Symmetry: C3
Subunit: 317 residues, 3 copies
């Protein structure tokens, strides 16, 4: 089935943030047996390999923005590979890597499927501009590089001249927000972006959260879905090996319920598993708890259900 | 008082699964002060003691099925004992022991109350037939031998000639499911059994789940309730000392909610507190934590309310 | 803004309970920088200092009730200070210290706003009378002294002659109950007090709980809200450094949600952050976790939101 036809793309990229380790994410995600687990799940899996991200020397900053040419080049590379995978009729599966790679993942996917809607699972909005940022870390800026309404609010940053915003403020729903900067909050409310912060999840329950997300995005017509999943969207008790953890997050059950309901539409076309840093777990156990949760989240996207699954045969015969 | 009249049966049996220790379940639950705690709770308790399950040497496998004569005879003796407690006008309380004992518990309970309904709290369906099973472990097969619709699918297993299925597929509700075999999922779906996996609990909340379960079983007519509670039904962060643990389980509150709501019906008639294994704790605290959650679930079954309880006396005078 | 205009009162008092260390609650909340964090949240903050409690010699018990003159004078002192804060148009924020201080907190607030409505977030009802108590601890008795309907059921207790019951049994809503003494449960039933125990929280979800809480208190017209927050209302996984912890409490998320909802009304006029004991944490991290949780609870009451916040300026210019 098309909802089970996958194309793996590794992205060993870390320069979108200061913490070293997130680049090892795809290697650690593969050592868990991801291809194998999906193969047994009736999935047509193809490994497109790990992208060759060349070391760019003398990458001087753009104002407060760090490693611009490196982040722009990586996403540009990913945009071509994601675009190739989509023309091959496969669901793109990006294994990050920092959340800056989403500029490339969504842009590549939008070239083949421009009518796509985004579900951004994160504790963060990642909507800072090279002008609103306080840190200068580009992994907290990808949404601003992708929005059409934010054209002219983004300057000529070195390495991102290839960029052309491919989504409108209406084509994106946030889930799990609990750490939004003032600049980001001003962008969120003025653009009238649809979001479900932790407050909304507590009020409604993940069931109604999903009901409204899928209705708002897929109501009028059936359209491709791109799920960009920051592991920090879930509570640190489930994913501690991550760069920017925030308490009071989405539970393991909620994360599985989000990814189950998205499979159940059969409209998933793109997937991002981002911010898994194996060098940041306090114990080796906290590391495997993050990797196992990330694996479990991905499997649910492609059909693995808690009620169970079976093949189309008579088990009683 | 009918809902607070109890007959305790210790069922120290382990041969339905491969790990030693579960037979100590009746010991550790008693040492916790369960009996005394039930009497403090205005309960009329009788302890029928522990069943002696005389050694069955010469108990070779039936295909891949391990210890069939031992599992068969322990359930048969438990069936006689449960029926006896039921004649004496008491709610039967089986302290296990592995979940294969449920064949005895439900058969014995049904011998006296053939109109009973089953609420099965577990991560697993335990509905593999001796032919769909890959493990050969009988603790994952109790429901198959009890379901009337599966007659002609259960072969002639030594030790089980006494079994006559007593529950129709329409008379059972599963709660807590998250690890179901392909063969089991096919059975579940083809026979149209009412279930609420972890997906449904996430979707509706435990509030609607219990309202639906009690309306589903008692809507047509008020009948006796048999609750078979597997401790692995609750999350291993609450019940870690258990042989088959699965992450993303029922919370402490959710578990007390299910039992508090079953209590209020006033119709509880049979109770099974299965799979506590005090030798499967990684630390001594994990053991106490398991036994304590088990005892707290039990006390809610017989009247303990979180809002409080009071005697019909004037506390102000 | 009126809802971000605060009067800080420290109450370093522990004689309402037997466990030493709760008097250091004002010290640790201040050290965690609560006042500095409030001013960064656009709050008008005046510091009224930490109340000096004169050590009373020959404090003979009244029956089983320990230190009545000490508890009685400390509430008498706080009642004065709160009235003073209320008179100068500020929201009184009391940093405790044991929960007996709510006698003085609420009495003081009702002297200036006699139409106040009380939300009591706690694992306990604290409604024991000096005669229904078996512990003799006054931190488990403040609601009995404040309720009008119990006048005649409270005898002449030394240190409390200045007390005049100021609220009706219908002017209070409990959230989080799971540990209620029989006499307290009796009073709860006979006086028809509105409550959401953990049972109602599990049944309805914190959304419906907050809808019904504000609707019940504010339905007829806007009235001022007094929130009495005992850290033990939350689960000991989030607030361990406390005197009377109980399993199955409100989550970190549900706590934030209650407070975010109260702030949104713009009617918070009285607040008590109670029962933090920095000497009761097993590790130094248990102490910081409690304190950080208490800090976050106080921040939500004065505007801090999980969807984000911002100054009324243009961030894109
Ligand atoms: C908790 C604080 C100290 C921390 N700086 C933190 O989380 N902050 C977030 C929110 N805005 C920051 C930025 O713009 O640099 C951070 C972005 C995170 C990017 B993401 O892909 O991991 O979602
Ligand atoms: C997760 C996998 C590895 C594990 N073997 C596991 O839990 N599997 C379940 C599902 N079916 C298996 C069987 O037939 O043996 C197991 C039975 C569990 C029985 B019960 O009474 O404890 O519910
Ligand atoms: C769990 C049991 C053993 C324990 N004695 C416990 O918590 N019990 C509660 C209920 N009534 C007791 C009393 O009257 O002393 C306790 C009051 C707690 C006051 B509070 O401010 O912290 O809410
Ligand atoms: Mn992100
Ligand atoms: Mn994030
Ligand atoms: Mn079981
Ligand atoms: Mn089980
Ligand atoms: Mn309390
Ligand atoms: Mn209290």
């Amino acid at each position: 089935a098309k909802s089970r036809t996958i194309g793996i793309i590794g992205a060993p990229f870390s320069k979108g943030q200061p913490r070293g380790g997130v680049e090892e994410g795809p290697t650690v995600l593969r050592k868990a047996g991801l291809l194998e687990k999906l193969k047994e799940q009736e999935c047509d899996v193809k490994d497109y390999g790990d992208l060759p991200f060349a070391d760019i020397p003398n990458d001087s900053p753009f104002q407060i923005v760090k490693n611009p040419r490196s982040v722009g080049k990586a996403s540009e590379q990913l945009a071509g590979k994601v675009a190739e995978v989509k023309k091959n009729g496969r669901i793109s599966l990006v294994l990050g890597g920092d959340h800056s790679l989403a500029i490339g993942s969504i842009s590549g996917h939008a070239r083949v499927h421009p009518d796509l809607g985004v579900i951004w699972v994160d504790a963060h909005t990642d909507i800072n501009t090279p002008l609103t940022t306080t840190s200068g870390n580009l992994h907290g800026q990808p949404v601003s590089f992708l929005l059409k309404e934010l054209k002219g609010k983004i300057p000529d940053v070195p390495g991102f001249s290839w960029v052309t915003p491919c989504i409108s403020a209406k084509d994106i729903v946030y889930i799990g927000l609990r750490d939004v900067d003032p600049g980001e909050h001003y962008i969120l409310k003025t653009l009238g972006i649809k979001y479900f912060s932790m407050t909304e999840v507590d009020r409604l329950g993940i069931g109604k959260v999903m009901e409204e997300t899928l209705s708002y995005l897929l109501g009028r017509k059936k359209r491709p879905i791109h799920l960009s999943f920051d592991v920090d969207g879930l509570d640190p008790s489930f994913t501690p090996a991550t760069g920017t953890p925030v308490v009071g997050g989405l539970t393991y059950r909620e994360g599985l319920y989000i990814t189950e309901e998205i499979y159940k539409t059969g409209l998933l076309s793109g997937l991002d598993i981002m911010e898994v840093n194996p060098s940041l777990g306090k114990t080796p156990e906290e590391v495997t708890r993050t990797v196992n949760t990330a694996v479990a989240i991905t499997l649910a996207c492609f059909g693995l259900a808690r009620e169970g699954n079976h093949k189309p045969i008579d088990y009683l015969n």
